[PDB]
Amino acid sequence: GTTVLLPLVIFFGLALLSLLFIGLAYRYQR
Amino acid sequence: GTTVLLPLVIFFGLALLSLLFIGLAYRYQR
């Protein structure tokens, strides 16, 4: 019951990927 | 049908990770 948090955390984890993607460009541009 | 697009876009991000992981293996391992 009240398993509304389960989907939210999965989507929230995706946020880390976004930050990691931005950092990738930084490494290629000093 | 209800907010079906929300989970679809989250899964899409998952595919992007595959590109980021595959690209790392090539650079860190010919």
Place this chain on the structure above:
Amino acid sequence: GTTVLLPLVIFFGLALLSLLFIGLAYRYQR
């Protein structure tokens, strides 16, 4: 249910990002 595997595979991708996250701290540590 019917699509129990669908969310499981999406979560499975998140596990890989966990290892990548470890490398981020190392680079920012030294």
